[PDB]
Design a protein around this nucleic acid. Sequence first.
RNA 1: AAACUUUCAACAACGGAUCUCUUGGUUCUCGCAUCGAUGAAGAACGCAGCGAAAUGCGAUACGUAAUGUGAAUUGCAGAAUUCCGUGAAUCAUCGAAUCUUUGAACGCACAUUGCGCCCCUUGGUAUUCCAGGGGGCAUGCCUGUUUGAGCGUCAUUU
RNA 2: UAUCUAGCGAAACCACAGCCAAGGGAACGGGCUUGGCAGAAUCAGCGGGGAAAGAAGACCCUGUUGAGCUUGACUCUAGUU
RNA 3: ACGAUCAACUUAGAACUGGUACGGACAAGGGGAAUCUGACUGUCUAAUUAAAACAUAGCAUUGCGAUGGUCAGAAAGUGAUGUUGACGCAAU
RNA 4: GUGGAGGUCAGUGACGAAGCCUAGACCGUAAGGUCGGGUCGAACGGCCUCUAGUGCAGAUCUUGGUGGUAGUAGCAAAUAUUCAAAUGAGAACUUUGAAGACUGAAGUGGGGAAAGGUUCCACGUCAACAGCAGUUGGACGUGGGUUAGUCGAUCCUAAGAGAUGGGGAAGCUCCGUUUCAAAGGCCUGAUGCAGGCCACCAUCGAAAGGGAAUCCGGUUAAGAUUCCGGAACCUGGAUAUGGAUUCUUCACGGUAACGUAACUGAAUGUGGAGACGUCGGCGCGAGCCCUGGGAGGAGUUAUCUUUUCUUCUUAACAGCUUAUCACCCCGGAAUUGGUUUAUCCGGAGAUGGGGUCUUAUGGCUGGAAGAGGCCAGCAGCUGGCUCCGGUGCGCUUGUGACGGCCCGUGAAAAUCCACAGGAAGGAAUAGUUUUCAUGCCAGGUCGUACUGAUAACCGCAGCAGGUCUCCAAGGUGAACAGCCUCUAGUUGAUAGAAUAAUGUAGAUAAGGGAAGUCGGCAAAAUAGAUCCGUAACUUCGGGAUAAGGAUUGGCU
RNA 5: UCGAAUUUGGGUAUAGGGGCGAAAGACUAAUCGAACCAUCUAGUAGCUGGUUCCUGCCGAAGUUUCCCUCAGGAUAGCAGA
RNA 6: AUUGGCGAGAGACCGAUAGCGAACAAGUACAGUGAUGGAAAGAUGAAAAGAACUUUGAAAAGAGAGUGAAAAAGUACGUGAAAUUGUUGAAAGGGAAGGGCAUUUGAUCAGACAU
Lengths: 50, 57, 60, 81, 251
Amino acid sequence: AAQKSFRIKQKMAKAKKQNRPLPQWIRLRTNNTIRYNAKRRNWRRTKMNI
Amino acid sequence: RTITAADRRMVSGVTEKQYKKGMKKMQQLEKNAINTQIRREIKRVNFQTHYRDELLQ
Amino acid sequence: VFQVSMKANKYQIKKAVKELYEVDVLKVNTLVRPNGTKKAYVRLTADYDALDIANRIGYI
Amino acid sequence: GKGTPSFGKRHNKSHTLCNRCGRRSFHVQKKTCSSCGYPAAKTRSYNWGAKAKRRHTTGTGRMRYLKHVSRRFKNGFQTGS
Amino acid sequence: GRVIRNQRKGAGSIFTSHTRLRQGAAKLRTLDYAERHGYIRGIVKQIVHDSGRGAPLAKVVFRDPYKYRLREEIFIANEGVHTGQFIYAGKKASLNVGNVLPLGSVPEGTIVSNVEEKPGDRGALARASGNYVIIIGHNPDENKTRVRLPSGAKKVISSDARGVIGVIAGGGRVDKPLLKAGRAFHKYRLKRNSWPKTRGVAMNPVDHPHGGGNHQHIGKASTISRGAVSGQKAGLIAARRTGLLRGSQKT
RNA sequence: AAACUUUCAACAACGGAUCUCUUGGUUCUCGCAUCGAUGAAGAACGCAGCGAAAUGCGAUACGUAAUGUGAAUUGCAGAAUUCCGUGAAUCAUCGAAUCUUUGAACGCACAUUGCGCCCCUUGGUAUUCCAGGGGGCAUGCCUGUUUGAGCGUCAUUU
RNA sequence: UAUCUAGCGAAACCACAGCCAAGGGAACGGGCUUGGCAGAAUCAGCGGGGAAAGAAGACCCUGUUGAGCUUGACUCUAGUU
RNA sequence: ACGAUCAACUUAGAACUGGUACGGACAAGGGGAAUCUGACUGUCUAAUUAAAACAUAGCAUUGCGAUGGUCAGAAAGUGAUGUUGACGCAAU
RNA sequence: GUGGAGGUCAGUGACGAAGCCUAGACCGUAAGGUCGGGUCGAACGGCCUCUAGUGCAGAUCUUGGUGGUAGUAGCAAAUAUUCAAAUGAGAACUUUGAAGACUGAAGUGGGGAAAGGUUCCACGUCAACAGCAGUUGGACGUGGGUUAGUCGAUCCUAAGAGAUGGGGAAGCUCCGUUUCAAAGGCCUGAUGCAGGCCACCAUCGAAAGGGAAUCCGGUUAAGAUUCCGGAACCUGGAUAUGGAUUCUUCACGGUAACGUAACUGAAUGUGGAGACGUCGGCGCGAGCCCUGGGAGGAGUUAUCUUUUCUUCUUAACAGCUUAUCACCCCGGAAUUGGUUUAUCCGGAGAUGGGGUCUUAUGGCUGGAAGAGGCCAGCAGCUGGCUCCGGUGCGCUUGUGACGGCCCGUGAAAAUCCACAGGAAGGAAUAGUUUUCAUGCCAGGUCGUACUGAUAACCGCAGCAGGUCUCCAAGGUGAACAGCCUCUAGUUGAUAGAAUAAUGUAGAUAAGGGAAGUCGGCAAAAUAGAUCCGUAACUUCGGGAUAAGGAUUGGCU
RNA sequence: UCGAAUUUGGGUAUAGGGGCGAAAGACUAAUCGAACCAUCUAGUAGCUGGUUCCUGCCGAAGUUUCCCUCAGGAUAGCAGA
RNA sequence: AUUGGCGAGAGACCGAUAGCGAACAAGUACAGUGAUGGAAAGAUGAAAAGAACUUUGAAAAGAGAGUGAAAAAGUACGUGAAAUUGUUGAAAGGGAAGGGCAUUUGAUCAGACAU
């Protein structure tokens, strides 16, 4: 809602911070297994349930 | 935009060509995982527990 | 325009600006950015130049 | 109908964020979290929920202080330098 | 079988009364020293309607004997009580309509209302609209008086029990037939959710003792025993006799 | 006769079986006794030059202090006598600290980043108002301290 | 709309499959036997058949399988006296 | 007896007129004679049954004067009716 | 025959172990064993024994993978798209322009509540998604953005929830919310206190109830009653001057209703506001609608048109004034009068004459024309005008006085105010107040972008479903019915070509008119308005629009 | 049907043998003649389905008696070793 | 006594559909309002030496070139089966295909005389 609580907005900020792909330099580290951001969220595909 | 994320990644060690290539690889991997998920979930996604079936049985 | 810790209020921001940079502030307007940090618009008095003290701080 | 037309009327929130645990299982009207028993003193756990205890037992988190107790015991809770 | 409706009505929930709009509890003065030795005078400020109650309430301002305050008591109006009337409550009050007197201080045949059941509480008998109690007689030996209740029952009570002189007013309220179902709906909208009532014989056999069957019939005797447990007391409870009276049956 | 269909082989496809590895699991044995109001377990949110996560940490924040080792970390950038030395390190050890908001959670509440009260102190021409800084304010119970209550009750006094 | 085309593009179902008559046969065959016949690849319709598809028949019966309900079944019980 | 000035759609009437049309599109009751049944308005089987079923006002019966009737709780210094009192509550 | 173990063959092997393919070969009746060829890269085998999670075609078997169906069903509701240019490798789908349309103000418009959480906006961009396409996007990558003393939360209490004192319960906990309690905070002059005061009873409970106070213009890629400019108000607190007030110590005036620039007032009580239903008609106000003159611009001009469209606006706040109701003074009324649309009032004092009040609301002025709007000229600047009216069963809305209805009479508290009272204080520079004016300081925390739906919520989704509410133009018409249009917004839904059967939806049919069918199912018929006419029956209210007929335009 | 027994948002109360029901065994999150989740539980089944390599030798019974026994067991018989 | 915690040593155990659900950013992603439910997913090479450069294409990519012992290892990466599919080659085909016995025909093949 537009009229929202600060706890909700803090979770919003956390989600916006997390909403990004893998940093590219991480792929170049030795013994790197991470291939892509497997926890990438999007508003059209999965609701946050908060 | 005095300095861009392009400059930040260039100093981080990934150039523009490597950025584009790695991003394409990431989209490829996500698409492969998506294809696999649909293929596996099609088998048992249509198992509604309490479906009605107007013409019973 | 200053980034401010979320634990600060308008009085704290006023006093802190007055202490760090010796300029009187006319008002403070604080909001919470969607990335989760306070953003404070500190309007100084008419007899100080924001463009002057900004490049004094270091950013033009 | 009881299906699609009635699934459009669900826009309230029976549960919200709990404080003791971050779960979205704090009953708004009952005021009791349905997963951790807040605000009761005892965290709501049951022996029939083996997986429930396994999810939230000690060691599933940071263990901010319990991590070093083994070190301190192995050194005998020494003091000094 | 399922817990029947009358069984469900004791636990509360939706069967509590709807007491938002009620002006307050209709009670007399506390049995103070002044009222139990002489009398005290109050002034009828206003007569008001009480939601869910047929008889209008009367608000009487009484001076506080032991403090400046004005103790405003919510009486039950008697037919004759009006705004601006002086109400004399106590043992030494003269016998006029609206005065409160202990039943040992009134002559025989007196009509009283809101009669105290035992000296000390604040009115128990004959408070519904149009109802009254008749002072049948006295007994100074044991400090009792015999009275006739609205139900035609004879009772004996301590002569120091109080009671307002007159009738509860609002009488004949049940003469007028509620034509629409909406009239009853609004009558019970302020009364405890006891309407509409589904016949047990129309209920399914799980929901009521009378339910079930290929015809809407009770099936067994509907005169239920007094000693029957809760959940069996559906119908005529402890019925000495049934059917239409067909007789004088006293007046 | 072609096409098409079928059967087989070669090469190529879809798919990830077989084979071979294995910082994992499982079971057994042995030794130890160490959570928490000096605030635990758990949670939320944040912290890196460049990280979303895992791991680590708490506004001193992938950490500070102490000790040992003795020259790295590394994907890049940077730092580089920093290295014949109180000294690199995403090292090891760990006895000193910091330890946000919480949580048995403890001033009152909490779907509020709400509302108080006290002490010291600073500013606003201020014991009262406002603001900043620091320290506090739960309950049950014990021992003790102090102040009391009760013709429950003793002595003494008019 | 169907139909044809460009793009996109499933599902039900599928022992193997698909021309009949008669015979016998689990007493109503697509296959078996005796006959009739039988020529690639196909399109739009179509509803005779595939005892077509959907569901381990709900009707009935069996089970020393239940459940809802009833009572004066058997054995108890809350409450109440 | 009475003059000037300003202002609005409402009804009635009369000519004239037309390929007798004109609520010109839109919009918009089929009606009558009966029978069974439920008085009526209302409500229910969301997702096969909207009814003649339920409810209803009306009528009637029953319990109860509070140390009470009906009902709830494992218990309570517990509770609903009850902010109540037979023109009331409770059960049919 | 297989996994694994003991022994042995000083077994095989990077010069290639295992595995895998092999209509190539040999052996055994068979389970299977051996060999050649290709692929391949690191372990494996024969024999004597031991051990077992040891042998698959099925179990509507489990998992995983893949087929015919099949380039098939289909991508067909919401009226509809077309041309040119640009961009681009590529355009039915992007953009711009030119058309044609639709939603038609109970919209496909403009905002919000729940919900969503960055979808908002910019730049770059097509791997995937947008069931066609794509240069486009709610997609991808990177960033930007949400500014409050006045709007909400915060505060109050509603239905209710819930500790403490208590009391149950083995116990997790339960009852209970002021009761079987030794339950505290307020005013001070200084933690007693001078001392006094009070006896109420933790707390939570509404982003639609109550509630301290903010409006206009401008501004952004995206903000806004929050920013900027200007102009106000509230609260808290210091608080100085002026005014007011007095030796008659705490004001005057009016016959009165009552007026003021103020014009002491403790404890304690009283009252008021908060504070309230629904419907009907009437009055008034606002906004909108219609329209006249005039001052500008635009459209039309074969012909006509003093034409058609369009701008002419004045916020919060302040001063003066303004009203139905109500009340006051004089007077004393039947020949009863006054009066509403609605029948109510008058010797408990009418009509009438004169006055007081509330300021809903309107007028003037200040705010403020300096703003905004509309034009013209010159290269941003400079000028003008922004004026005066009219009407209403008009629509929405506010409000007033009323009336109808109930066995329905239609919240609470915080808070604020006043009154009764006379505790206490103030006397002549002695002063006391400062509900008067002016002046000073501060107002924290959190929310603030966007959608709010045939694409931003929920329905597995970019689903013809569901989801609360505000504003609401013109014509026809009784009508926020149907139809057309203005401001505004869309032009989205795969498309092209033909017009077979069968369909779905819409229709029409000569004669007959239910003969069809279980059954007039479906369809048709009538329909608005005015006038006439209207039966049996009836609970006397109805039946009733009964039935059955006539008229209906335009123009003068 | 459309001014009221009206429709509806938010708050709030009632929780599974319980609620609520103008009464249909209706509603209680697509679940209702007893909701959902986990555990007891790999519940029991005289019933249905399946039960994985080769060869060799031998190779049957649906009958007796008794069982709340009649879709099953015990016993005797037939069969192998 | 010990299926919890810490520290160790082992196995005729399992070897990525097995073994804990989790050998991996696993009680993670994800579903449900909620209690709860809950996966999939290991391997290039010794070393990225991860394909400089040329050319066709708008681009993805392709063809060369090159690294490599091997691109029959190209971040879809060890080996790479079967179902299923494409091309090439062979053969057959009048409403099934498949099978047994026997031989003709075509293709293919071992052994033995040569000792």
